[PDB]
Design an enzyme around this catalytic site. Sequence first.
Site, short mmCIF file in Angstrom:
data_model
loop_
_atom_site.label_atom_id
_atom_site.label_comp_id
_atom_site.label_asym_id
_atom_site.label_seq_id
_atom_site.Cartn_x
_atom_site.Cartn_y
_atom_site.Cartn_z
N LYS A 196 36.20 32.26 48.80
CA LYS A 196 36.83 32.28 47.49
C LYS A 196 38.36 32.27 47.64
CE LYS A 196 36.92 35.58 43.70
NZ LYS A 196 36.54 36.96 43.33
N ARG A 237 39.55 29.11 48.63
CA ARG A 237 39.51 28.21 47.46
C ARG A 237 40.72 28.41 46.55
NH1 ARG A 237 37.80 28.74 42.42
NH2 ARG A 237 36.59 30.67 42.76
N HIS A 297 43.62 30.56 47.20
CA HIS A 297 44.97 30.73 47.75
C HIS A 297 45.49 29.93 48.95
CE1 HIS A 297 45.27 34.11 44.93
NE2 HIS A 297 44.01 34.31 45.28
N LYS A 317 43.76 31.30 34.50
CA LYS A 317 44.27 32.38 35.37
C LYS A 317 45.75 32.55 35.10
CE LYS A 317 43.16 34.04 40.02
NZ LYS A 317 44.14 34.47 41.05
N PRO A 318 46.19 33.80 34.80
CA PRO A 318 47.59 34.12 34.50
C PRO A 318 48.66 33.85 35.56
CG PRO A 318 46.08 35.76 33.62
CD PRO A 318 45.36 35.01 34.69
N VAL A 319 48.41 34.29 36.79
CA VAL A 319 49.34 34.12 37.90
C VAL A 319 48.51 33.80 39.14
CG1 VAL A 319 51.28 35.21 39.12
CG2 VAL A 319 50.65 36.04 36.89
N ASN A 320 49.00 32.87 39.97
CA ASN A 320 48.31 32.50 41.21
C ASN A 320 49.32 31.99 42.22
OD1 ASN A 320 45.41 32.05 42.46
ND2 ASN A 320 46.66 30.28 43.02
N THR A 321 48.99 32.11 43.51
CA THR A 321 49.87 31.70 44.61
C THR A 321 49.09 30.93 45.67
OG1 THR A 321 50.92 33.87 44.35
CG2 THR A 321 51.56 32.58 46.27
N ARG A 360 52.44 30.32 37.14
CA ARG A 360 52.26 31.29 36.04
C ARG A 360 52.28 30.60 34.66
NH1 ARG A 360 57.47 33.10 34.23
NH2 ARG A 360 56.27 34.46 32.85
N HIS A 404 41.63 39.00 49.83
CA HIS A 404 42.33 39.04 48.53
C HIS A 404 43.84 39.01 48.77
CE1 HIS A 404 38.88 41.96 48.44
NE2 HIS A 404 38.44 41.06 47.59
N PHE A 405 44.58 38.42 47.82
CA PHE A 405 46.05 38.29 47.85
C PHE A 405 46.62 39.44 47.04
CE2 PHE A 405 50.15 36.52 46.70
CZ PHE A 405 50.48 35.73 47.80
N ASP A 406 47.30 40.38 47.69
CA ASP A 406 47.85 41.52 46.96
C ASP A 406 49.21 41.34 46.29
OD1 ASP A 406 46.47 44.04 46.42
OD2 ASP A 406 48.30 45.01 47.25
#
Length: 124
Positions: A7, A10, A12, A41-45, A85, A119-121
């Site tokens: 995931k 997929r 990040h 999705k609000p914010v992603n990197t 964003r 997970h991306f913190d």
Amino acid sequence: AESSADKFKRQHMDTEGPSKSSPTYCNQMMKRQGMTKGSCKPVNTFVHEPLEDVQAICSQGQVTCKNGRNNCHKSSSTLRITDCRLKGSSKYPNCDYTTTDSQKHIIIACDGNPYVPVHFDASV
């Protein structure tokens, strides 16, 4: 469901994406990668770096997590990242993002055995 590590791959990772992201990268990639489904999705990197280099972060100094857990690690170098964003206008299903380029340290959360990223913190 899919692996918690698949995931992440997929959502990040984008190893050979341009370091010169056009202002339409986000709108394009957020949709192609599935982060547009039931909602925007609000914010992603995205991390334009080899997986080998990202997996290695799980061996660096450990920092605590946002949820209070023991498995997070802060990168010892700056990675090539891209932030996406949402915009004020946006009305699902027409998700509209702003493509921002940068280069900051990433804090990821690893787990399992093989101890792999999950997970991306944060971005520092």
